[PDB]
């Protein structure tokens, strides 16, 4: 087997973005393989894909991953 | 078997986005493989796929993954 | 097996971006390999993909990963 | 097996970007290899991808990684 | 096996960029190899990719890495 | 086996450069080698890729690395 865990505790801003382009296909996070036995795809934290996407102060949480 | 867990505890903003392209397709997070025996896709945290989607202050939780 | 974990605790700004370009495909973070036995894809913290994407004060959390 | 972890504790801006270029695809962080047995891909901290991306005071957390 | 970790504690501005150039593809940080057994990709701290990208006071956090 | 770690504590600006030149592809930090068994890619601190990119007072945290 394999193990992982996390927790959070706590005890105690303007931004301008105008987008402009005529074309672009976009992929966030990816991998590919033919003839491949153990394709394992793992993702955590904060992630998004968009022709525009913006990351103000985005992560206050915590985390981890493991495999194989 | 295989193991993970978490939970969250606690003891105690302007942004502009204008979209512009007419259409051009987007896929957020994915992976591909022909001829694959141990085909595993695993996902956590905060995720969306959309032509625009935005990540203001998004993650307060916690989490983790394992497989094989 | 493999093990990982993390936590957060706590005890105690203007920016201009105007985009302009005529075309661009964009991929955030990616890798590729044919004929691969142990294809492992892992990501943490904060990452986002867009023809524009901006990272004000983005990470207040903490984290780590391991595999194989 | 392999182990990693981290934590944050705490006890106690004017910038302009004008974008202008006519074309240029962008990729953030990436690597590639054919015939490759143990492709292992890992990332953390704060990283983002676009034709322009700006990193104001962006990292206030902590972390690390290990594999193989 | 292998180990890594880090932490942060704490106890206690104008700049101009106008971009102008006619074309440029840009890649943040990358490496490549055919015929490779132990392809390992690791990144930390703060890094971002753009045809223009600017780093005011970007790191207050801390970190390290190790592998294989 | 292998080990690494670090930490930070604490207890106790005008500049003009406007960009103009006609073309440039730019890569931040990279290396390549075919027929290479132990391709190991590790990076820290802050570095950013852009045809013009400016680093006022950018890294005030700390770190170091080793692998294999």
Please give the interface size between C and D, counted as residue pairs whose CB atoms are below 8 Å apart. Answer: 244
For C55, the closest of E2, E4, E48 (CB atoms) is E48
| CA A63 and chain centroid, separation | 12
Residue in B closest to C15 by C-alpha: B15
For D48, the closest of A55, A64, A66 (CB atoms) is A55
Asked if the Cβ–Cβ distance from B31 to C41 is below 8 Å, we say: yes
Residue in A closest to C47 by C-alpha: A47
Answer whether A3's CB lies under 8 Å from B3's CB: yes
Please give the interface size between B and C, counted as residue pairs whose CB atoms are below 8 Å apart. Answer: 9
Distance CA B7, CA A59 (A): 16
Question: Considering only CB atoms, which chain A residues are within 8 Å of C16?
Answer: 16
Asked if the Cβ–Cβ distance from A56 to C57 is below 8 Å, we say: yes
Residue in A closest to D29 by C-alpha: A29
Rounded to 5 degrees, φ, ψ at A7 are -145, 165
Within 10 angstroms of residue A10's Cβ, the number of other Cβ atoms is 15
| CA E5 and chain centroid, separation | 18
Question: Considering only CB atoms, which chain F residues are within 8 Å of D51?
Answer: none
Q: Which method was used?
A: cryo-EM
Within 10 angstroms of residue B47's Cβ, the number of other Cβ atoms is 20
Q: What is the DSSP letter of B19?
A: -
Question: Considering only CB atoms, which chain D residues are within 8 Å of E31?
Answer: 31
Asked if the Cβ–Cβ distance from E45 to F45 is below 8 Å, we say: yes
Sign of CA dihedral B9, B14, B20, B22: positive
Asked if the Cβ–Cβ distance from C66 to E39 is below 8 Å, we say: no
Burial A28-63 (b: 16+ CB within 10 A, else e): bbbbbbeebebbbbbbbbbbbbbbbbbbbbbbbbbb
Chain breaks in chain B (C to N over 2.5 A) after: 12
Asked if the Cβ–Cβ distance from E43 to D29 is below 8 Å, we say: yes
Residue in C closest to B24 by C-alpha: C25
Asked if the Cβ–Cβ distance from E64 to F64 is below 8 Å, we say: yes
Distance from CA of E46 to the nearest CA of C (A): 10
Sheet holding A46-49, edge to edge: B46-49, A46-49, C46-49
Tokens of E48: 């971002």
Distance CA B23, CA A23 (A): 8
Distance CA D63, CA C62 (A): 6
Tokens of E25: 């593809």
Residue F41 is assigned to a ligand binding site? no
Tokens of B32: 């591909």
């Amino acid at each position: 087997g394999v193990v992982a865990a996390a927790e959070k505790t706590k005890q105690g801003g303007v931004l301008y973005v105008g987008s402009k382009t005529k074309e672009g296909v976009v992929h966030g996070v990816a991998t590919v393989a033919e003839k491949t036995k153990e394709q394992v795809t793992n993702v955590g934290g904060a992630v998004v894909t968009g022709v525009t996407a913006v990351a103000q102060k985005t992560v206050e949480g915590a985390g981890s991953i493991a495999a194989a």
